[PDB]
Each structure stands twice: as C-alpha cells, then as structure tokens.
Nucleic acid binder design. Structure first.
Length: 104
RNA sequence: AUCG
C-alpha cells in the first residue's frame, strides 16, 4: 500500500472479480497485453463508462453486461492501438485446424 | 465487441 500495488497477477485477479468475468483468461489477457497499470486505468474508466451507461458488445442484443462494459474499454481506451484490441478479445480462443488442409 |  504505497502507490497502487499494480502487480499484474493481482490486477488480473482483481479485474475478473470486479467484472464477474465468465472467461477470466480473457480479462487477465487484457492485462497481459496492455499492461498492469493500463488495466487499472481501465478500472477507473469503467466508472466513467458506468456514469454514462455505454456498451455495445459483440451481439448488441445484450447491452451493458458487467464484464462487457470493461470490454467496451478496449474501444473507449484513449491510448491503445486497435490491433491490440482485436488481438485480445476478438480472437477469443479461436484456433486453427491447419486452416484449410486438415490432414486427418 | 461477453452468443457457448
């Protein structure tokens, strides 16, 4: 308890709890990709999104899901490149069966 | 950008 104690492991554990994250590997991933403090910066920004009530998730049908609101942060984030944004949650957990020629 |  001196500065913020933004240890990325603690951070990832914090985000997932606060967003009630279903797929906590993702919420921890944001941490890994953007940075330990950068994730906490988002925690403060989530309150800013909270006061405005903004979120459109991948489907748009569900609107303002707790974790999803934080997902909005990757779009609402001021200083992060969109490539990282796509790389984090837009890939989700997709893998490749040798792309086309899956020699089984 | 949270529909497995």
């Amino acid at each position: 308890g001196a500065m913020a104690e933004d240890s990325q492991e603690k951070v990832a554990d914090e985000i997932s709890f606060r967003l009630q994250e279903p797929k906590k590997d993702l919420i921890a991933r944001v941490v890994r990709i953007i940075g330990n403090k950068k994730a906490i910066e988002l925690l403060m920004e989530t309150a800013e999104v909270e006061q405005n009530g903004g979120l459109f998730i991948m489907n748009g049908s569900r609107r303002r899901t707790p974790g999803g609101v934080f997902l909005n942060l990757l779009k609402n984030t001021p200083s992060i490149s969109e490539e990282q944004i796509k790389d984090i949650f837009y890939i989700e957990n997709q893998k490749e069966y040798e792309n086309k020629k899956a020699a089984r």
